[PDB]
Amino acid sequence: IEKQMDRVVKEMRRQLEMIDKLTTREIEQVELLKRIHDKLVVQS
Amino acid sequence: EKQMDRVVKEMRRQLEMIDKLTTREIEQVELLKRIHDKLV
Amino acid sequence: MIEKQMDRVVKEMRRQLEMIDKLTTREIEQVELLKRIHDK
Amino acid sequence: IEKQMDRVVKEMRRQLEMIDKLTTREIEQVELLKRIHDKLVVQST
Ligand code: NI
Ligand code: NI
To answer: Distance between CA A20 and CA A1 in Å, rounded?
Structure first.
């Protein structure tokens, strides 16, 4: 019972880290896209 | 000239494609944050 | 999700993002050149 | 008659210009709402 809980808890913590890394990387990609967008807005 | 006007029109179309890309990426981030909050 | 599958998709988007930056940079340069020649 | 049609068409063109002005404002309103929405998302992470 304790061993099952630690397996589930360890799996959740791994998914929280992967979710954190994917959201961080997508936010940076969005920021980059917005900079390109703003360069296009002015230059057009 | 016509070549300059064509490229300006292409840039405006690309602004629309970038907007769709940022909207989808932002919405994916919102979902991921909602999933994450289920657990914390 | 698996970390290797997530890194594959993210790195591919980053590569496509760099191509969008280079292509829009070239498009900005084209408008600048066309205006400079036309302005003479 | 041709003169009646010219009056009607000129009036229709005036209404199309009002749609143009409304669309210009709608462009800004949609852009502002999207920028605010996206900033709220990013800040909340
Ligand atoms: Ni987290
Ligand atoms: Ni939203």
So the answer is: 29
> Resolution of the experimental model in angstroms, please?
2.2
Contact list, A27 vs chain D (CB under 8 Å)? 42, 45
Q: How many CB atoms lie within 10 A of CB A33?
A: 19
Instruction: Report d(CA A2, CA A16) in Å as an integer.
Output: 21
Distance (Å, rounded) from C-alpha D44 to C-alpha A4? 33
* List of chain B residues whose C-beta atoms are within 8 Å of the C-beta of residue D44: 33
> Do D and A count as touching (3 or more CB pairs closer than 8 A)?
yes
CATH number at residue B29: 1.20.5.430
Domain of A22?
Answer: 1-44
Q: Report residue D45 as tokens.
A: 């992470």
Gap between the Cα atoms of C39 and D14, Å rounded: 35
